[PDB]
Design a protein around this ligand. Structure first.
Ligand SMILES: *[C]C1=C([C])[C]=C2C(=[C]1)N([C][C]([O])[C]([O])[C]([O])[C]OP([O])(=O)OP([O])(=O)O[C][C]1O[C](N3[C]=NC4=C3N=[C]N=C4[N])[C]([O])[C]1[O])C1=NC(=O)[N]C(=O)C1=N2/[C]=C(/[C][C]C1=[C][C]=C(F)[C]=[C]1)[C]=[N]
Ligand SMILES: *[C]C1=C([C])[C]=C2C(=[C]1)N([C][C]([O])[C]([O])[C]([O])[C]OP([O])(=O)OP([O])(=O)O[C][C]1O[C](N3[C]=NC4=C3N=[C]N=C4[N])[C]([O])[C]1[O])C1=NC(=O)[N]C(=O)C1=N2/[C]=C(/[C][C]C1=[C][C]=C(F)[C]=[C]1)[C]=[N]
Ligand SMILES: CCCCCCCCCCCC[N+](C)(C)CCCS(=O)(=O)O
Ligand SMILES: CCCCCCCCCCCC[N+](C)(C)CCCS(=O)(=O)O
Lengths: 499, 494
């Protein structure tokens, strides 16, 4: 029953919050809906795979909070394979390349690709990380879908095609579903377009040895009996002196404060007394999560390396079930695997098939993209459809439809009496990621410490020292990249000269 | 505990369903979250106002199911006052007019205005009521907001701004928030633009004497002790022989079947076992309700009538808190009142003020629009902010953001094992209205009757005879309206 803080949700954010509060000498309890911790991170273990992350997996430079938490728990990272060539597959043809971006030869298309990425970052610098709705043109950009923005920025179909896949891959949603302001914020708060898309020096650089599920599992071992599995929270009562939190099995928990560490829309699963204020009440009906199936196809050997392919494929085409893959082979070089994401409307569409039908379609895709018959000989298959999860709502994270972030964005992490809000969605740096989960979990925990008069106000938001293990090379631009004209800019120059 | 059907929700849809099933001889229970029935309809009574609808209120021709149900319960309608002139307030000036739509005098603006409304109805003709996702251009129309359609279609700012007001008023959401496909479906399934906007011969023609809350209240009286108030449903278990439904106060209800008669997104408040299928699991997080405050200012007399104004105001502009009003005076001519809607973003913005602050702004607005100092002396004020309701989620109804209706639309009323789906959102005619609530409640009830082998499949969807009290007159267009060019059409002719 009685404790200082009830934490709702035993994912990375809630576990990070409970650990901090526990380390500060408080009596904490974690109420987790599932028969496991980790939430949107999940590591399957069996003899065929040894271990595999079916949810969140990748970590990179500038994600210093998740890295410090994992290292303190005794965890280790390894580099995702990007030794050999990446593949860009478009119009049923594959084009090998090196570096983070698929190359473009056509001079007009090159100017258009260059300008697009530059403008994404240009617009990003106008958007405050901690308050996106404060951008000078917040309303104008929020009243617009990402599709509308692509339609007006991209003067070539090639750039529009690549930008569409970029959006699908980043936020597991269609360009027409998401606010332009929101998506521009989301990229900006991950350090920009290059940082977000990169394996080497980016978000996909590394994975944890043994899986990311260990983060939450090892925090559970530290907290012992304080974590309560199979306790979905149904009711929060704040009418009396102590906060009462009721679960589905009719257990009652009494606390001074509560941390909500669940996806914002999943707050709907809780009945509130007194009712939530007007803005939060409506906000939680307006914030869906994206759609993704994560699929891993195992092979006898990482045969793609022999053809000088690292395993990275960027696959454009409506026919392609998977738009993005990475090599998922173990660091020891065994359990050869290709990881792929089925994104947005394709997750919806391909979920109708059987596990066996999906495996078949993926192998047939990889065989064509890699130009390898070997790809038609899988030894094993694992997958996870996050759309069917009652206690996640989707993956990777929450997106904002047009008009919502400016109208409702400011209440996301605004406390409601004695309820404080964590979860990756409330973070200001790598929101949507395991990194943002740690940030938001530890920030929510400190808000409570301040409320109890244990720490000063200026200590609620805490900066993180850079990892020595995973150093961040800075994001650099060239003179040409900065000053090459857009397509309309070149046309302006043509019409002005020839006049 | 043990019954044939548990109905979740004591709104009009749930009550209609329960009444149908009860009259057919089944044991039904209604589980209602609030201390009252009615949901998005609510009739307040005090001696100052006598009675006032603070939620759903208006009914009109073609809404035959709500009219029949209310007539059986002993209810009667009266006509909303539209004898005198309507007012269009544009750029700080009032323009009195007659007929459902404000006149336009600039030739170019006239062509642009004409084309916009015509095109809305043209597009609607290709959208099936029972399956909007089967429209020929469903994906194209669903992937754009109403804002970009208006930007595309309206060559003049005058038309765009009136079209914007129209969207705001119909669906309590911003043009940029909503799918074009969904909005065009919404208008089409109310009988078209003219039918949805009209007072005389449209949706706003009539109100119930004594309030619309009496519909749900009188059905609850007919059901005896079968309606359970302050029983919010928290858990639905379908793993066993009969369905188990748990409430927040720990009570257990067992049934052969369930009707969910709540707004789709409020399905999130229930924990399901087994988990919901994937498409519904994600759908119920993708379907918000609009934002509105309904406000009624009372006066000593209906003074506007003396100046040959009926009370209807169509008010352009960002600064106007209220964009649309109706005379809310009682049929007897006493309790003189003006009803106004504070719509969409204005509802969020003006909720930060006090009740008294909102009253002052409305009175000053009405004084400008009506050209009368008498609007500055209210005798009484009532309001309801529907955004603050845990068990509604907003008003009037559920809107679909771009991409949603085509991807998730068909799951809305698709049964989940032994759970059937009612609620106005699942109706095919006047969805969003009290009428759709009745259609959906009775249809969901008959689906169960068919599942039980009591009626054939062809009796699940039943037609309704036209009301003798509120008959519908046909919607007509003129030759010029149908054949006048658009702005770009007039340009290609030049
Ligand atoms: C799903 C996914 C996938 C598939 C993938 C990925 C992901 C995901 N991500 C994301 C992550 O995972 C996240 O962010 C995290 O995890 C979050 O955390 P939090 O905040 O903590 O949350 P969660 O987990 O959900 O938890 C919660 C909890 O709670 C509970 N509940 C509910 N309800 C309730 C409860 N309890 C009680 N009561 C009640 N009522 C639940 O159960 C849970 O447990 C990620 N991340 C990272 O970091 N990384 C990665 O990798 C990931 N992934 C993805 C990504 C990447 C992709 C990309 C690629 C390429 C490019 F270019 C871009 C991008 C990211 N995101
Ligand atoms: C809010 C509102 C307002 C302000 C106004 C109006 C409206 C609204 N509307 C709408 C109506 O009302 C609706 O539709 C109805 O009501 C619906 O019904 P239903 O479906 O039945 O649903 P509800 O009510 O919501 O119910 C539900 C129930 O459930 C319950 N819950 C929840 N959750 C739960 C429960 N229980 C148990 N458990 C759980 N968990 C709740 O509580 C409830 O009770 C309308 N309508 C009509 O008809 N009329 C009218 O008038 C109305 N309004 C508005 C309109 C008009 C506007 C306009 C003007 C002008 C122009 F031109 C256009 C438009 C319509 N809409
Ligand atoms: C000699 C020049 C005459 C040009 C007249 C032809 C009109 C050109 C239309 C091309 C549209 C290009 N997209 C990318 C689709 C939208 C750009 C948006 S924005 O125009 O830059 O605002
Ligand atoms: C004889 C010269 C030919 C000029 C043709 C005129 C085309 C210029 C369009 C500008 C108006 C833009 N609005 C109205 C906002 C949108 C219209 C979109 S759409 O043109 O119908 O696609």
């Amino acid at each position: 029953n009685k404790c200082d803080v009830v934490v709702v949700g035993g994912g990375i954010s809630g576990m990070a919050a409970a650990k901090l509060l526990h380390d500060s000498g408080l009596n904490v309890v974690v109420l987790e809906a599932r028969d496991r911790v980790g939430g949107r991170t999940y590591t399957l273990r069996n003899q065929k795979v040894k271990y595999v992350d079916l949810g969140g997996s990748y970590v990179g430079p500038t994600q210093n909070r998740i890295l410090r938490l994992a290292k303190e728990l005794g965890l280790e990272t390894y580099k995702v394979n990007e030794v050999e060539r990446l593949i860009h597959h478009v119009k049923g043809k594959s084009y090998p390349f090196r570096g983070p971006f698929p190359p473009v030869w056509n001079p007009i298309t090159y100017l258009d690709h260059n300008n697009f990425w530059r403008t994404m970052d240009d617009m990003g610098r106008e958007i405050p990380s901690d308050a996106p709705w404060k951008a000078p043109l917040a309303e104008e950009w929020d009243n617009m879908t990402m599709k509308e923005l692509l339609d007006k920025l991209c003067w070539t179909e090639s750039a529009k095609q690549l930008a569409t896949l970029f959006v699908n891959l980043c936020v597991t949603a269609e360009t027409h579903e998401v606010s332009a302001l929101w998506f521009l914020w989301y990229v900006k708060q991950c350090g920009g377009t290059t940082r977000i898309i990169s394996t080497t020096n980016g978000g996909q650089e590394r994975k944890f040895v043994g899986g990311s599920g260990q983060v939450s599992e090892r925090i559970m071992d530290l907290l012992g009996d304080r974590v309560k599995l199979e306790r979905p929270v149904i009711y929060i009562d704040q009418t009396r002196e102590n906060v009462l939190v009721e679960t589905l099995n009719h257990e009652m928990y009494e606390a001074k404060y509560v941390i909500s560490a669940i996806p914002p829309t999943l707050g709907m699963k809780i009945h509130f007394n007194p009712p939530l204020p007007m803005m939060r009440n409506q906000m939680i009906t307006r914030v869906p999560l994206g759609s993704v199936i994560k699929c891993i196809v195992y092979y006898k050997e990482p045969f793609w390396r022999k053809k000088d392919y690292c395993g990275t494929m960027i696959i454009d085409g409506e026919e392609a079930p998977v738009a993005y893959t990475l090599d998922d082979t173990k660091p020891e070089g065994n359990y050869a695997a290709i990881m792929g994401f089925i994104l947005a409307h394709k997750a919806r569409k391909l979920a109708r098939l059987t596990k066996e039908e999906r495996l078949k379609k993926l192998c047939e895709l990889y065989a064509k993209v890699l130009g390898s018959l070997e790809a038609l000989e899988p030894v094993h298959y694992e997958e996870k459809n996050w759309c069917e999860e009652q206690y996640s709502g989707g993956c990777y994270t929450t997106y904002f439809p047009p008009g919502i972030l400016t109208q409702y964005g400011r209440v996301l992490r605004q406390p409601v009496d004695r309820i404080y809000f964590a979860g990756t969605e409330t973070a200001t740096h790598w929101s949507g990621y395991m990194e943002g989960a740690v940030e938001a979990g530890e920030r929510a925990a400190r808000e409570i410490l301040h409320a109890m008069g244990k720490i000063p106000e200026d200590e609620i938001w805490q900066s993180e020292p850079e990892s020595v293990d995973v150093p961040a090379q800075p994001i650099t631009t060239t003179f040409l990249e900065r000053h090459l004209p857009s397509v309309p800019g070149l046309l302006r120059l043509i019409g002005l000269t020839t006049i």
